[PDB]
Design a protein around this ligand. Sequence first.
Ligand SMILES: *C#CCN1CCOC1=O
Lengths: 56, 58
Amino acid sequence: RTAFSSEQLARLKREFNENRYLTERRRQQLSSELGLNEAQVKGWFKNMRAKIKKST
Amino acid sequence: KRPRTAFSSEQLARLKREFNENRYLTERRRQQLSSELGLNEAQVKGWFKNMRAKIKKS
DNA sequence: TTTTGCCATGTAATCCCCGGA
DNA sequence: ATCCGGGGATTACATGGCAAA
Ligand SMILES: *C#CCN1CCOC1=O
């Protein structure tokens, strides 16, 4: 299990805010810009959507 | 990868009879049906999956 | 208060379901 | 049969915050 830095979380949240689903291109770009693997970016967005859904 | 199998006419008759009642398999139903037919549970759930797609097309 | 102990909560990652191709 | 990309439900585990002598 990896813990994301606040700079990564900040960027992921802004990105989520603009578009809550990734394209392949964007997942690849985000992974490259943040120093993360595409599976981590994919997992984060998935979990975030679920977390919001569980509130309402 | 999982091997492709062939279903006997008796296995097909039984799968279709179940499918005619309910196009979706619960866990219990899949275990029961796979055990009765001598089929891997993955072949059973895969046949139901594929039958739903064929029917949505036809 | 300290500082020691345990457990609730958050969350990354997994598992399994579906339709579509 | 495969593989993908959703979803819901979980599991595993690390930290937080609170209990208590
Ligand atoms: C479980 C989980 C999160 N992940 C990891 C790769 O794809 C995901 O959705």
